Structure formats: structure tokens, C-alpha cells
């Protein structure tokens, strides 16, 4: 699932609603 994707560990925020 996406919770498992290894990324840099930054918080992600959406750019639109």
C-alpha cells in the first residue's frame, strides 16, 4: 500500500482541494 512506499520522509500536502 502507499503507507509502505519508501520516500525521503517529508510531509506531503495537496496543492488544491
Amino acid at each position, epitope marked *: *500500500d*502507499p*503507507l509502505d512506499h519508501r520516500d525521503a*520522509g*517529508d510531509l506531503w*500536502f*495537496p496543492g488544491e*482541494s
Partner: antibody
Amino acid sequence: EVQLLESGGGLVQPGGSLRLSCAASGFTFSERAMTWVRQAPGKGLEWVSSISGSGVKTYYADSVKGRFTISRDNSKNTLYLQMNSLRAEDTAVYYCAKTPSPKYVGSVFDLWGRGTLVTVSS
Amino acid sequence: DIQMTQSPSSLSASVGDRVTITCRASQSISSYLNWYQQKPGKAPKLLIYAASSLQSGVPSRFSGSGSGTDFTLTISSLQPEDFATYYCQQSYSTPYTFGQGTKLEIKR
């Protein structure tokens, strides 16, 4: 396998200080953002602070900005909340939580510790 | 901040029942809404993320949906282990905010 365990906390006077610690096991700590959430007695959940995996980016609730500092030690798998100028607003169980934050998902508190109690009183 | 209002605050239901808990945002938050479950004397656990996606190990009787300001958590066929307090939580923006909680108790 995966575990988070909070240390620290206890009773402090208004104006006082504490340092909470959260020990991570069973995952690659440096790859994961981490969060502190608190829960006042008989009340709901309130987000306190989050920190990027790298430790470079921090985020705070307005009520704790410039009193609390979130930090981490990637070398020792440890997340901290340094607390200054405490007030009774701050009395609560504090939980650390692993925070995956995928693209087109956002932050999710997918694993939580057991909680530690902070009491602020004269 | 983005105010999250859950409805109802308190809900009594029985095993087998279908219940719906609502979560409303004070502004659009797209689908960035998570749900947590909390039993007495225990830390919360993740149930659902991004409105609809089930956490590993969460039964299919839990479903969520919504986008914008209105969201639903539906538990079909309530089981004894499901009685707990439920919170929604928006991840659209910091500060991350939670609903006030919905205490789901068992009827007898």
C-alpha cells in the same frame, strides 16, 4: 515487530520544562516522518507537532510554537519533544506516531505508542 | 484551523447493526481524511486513510467515503470488538485537526 515507546513526562510546575522521548523499533526510522499527538483527561485528540524523516522540517500547533521543540536523532532511532514554559493547557497523555505521508494521501498516523502522562500544576 | 465536526457524538447500537458516523469539514479538504479507533485505556489505531483506503488488518465491514466537506464512516454488521470511540482527522493542512469523537457503545 514495529514498536514505539514513549519515555519522560511526569508532574511539572507552570513555567517548567520536560523532555519526552520516543524509541522506535522494527522499521527504518530515518525514512519516516514522526508526530506527537496528545489527549487531555476525558477529552479528544489534539495534534502537537510533526517532523520530517530528515529532521530538517518541523511543524507545530500555534499554541505550542516557541515553547516546544520537536527533534530527532536518526542515529539512535529516537524522537523528542522538548517542552518549555509549560502550562495546564499541556496536561495530557502524549503519544508518538509514525507518520507515512504519501503523495495524494497526506499524513497518516499509522502506528502509535502507548502514551506518557504529563501533568502541569502548582 | 479546519474545524472537524462529527455526528453523532454518542451512538448506541447492537451487534449486527449497520451504523453511519458523519464527519464534516469547515472547508473543503478534498479526500484527505483519516479515521482512528480508540478503546478504553489504549492508544488510537488507524482504520481508514484518504477517506476510503483500509489499513492492513482492518475488516471489510468498515468503509469510508467522501470528498470536499462531508464524509462517512459506515460499519456494517457491528461486531463486539468494534465498540470504541472513533475520530476523524484532516491531513489537508497543518494544524492537523481531529473531530471531537463518536463514542459507539453497545445496546443491551
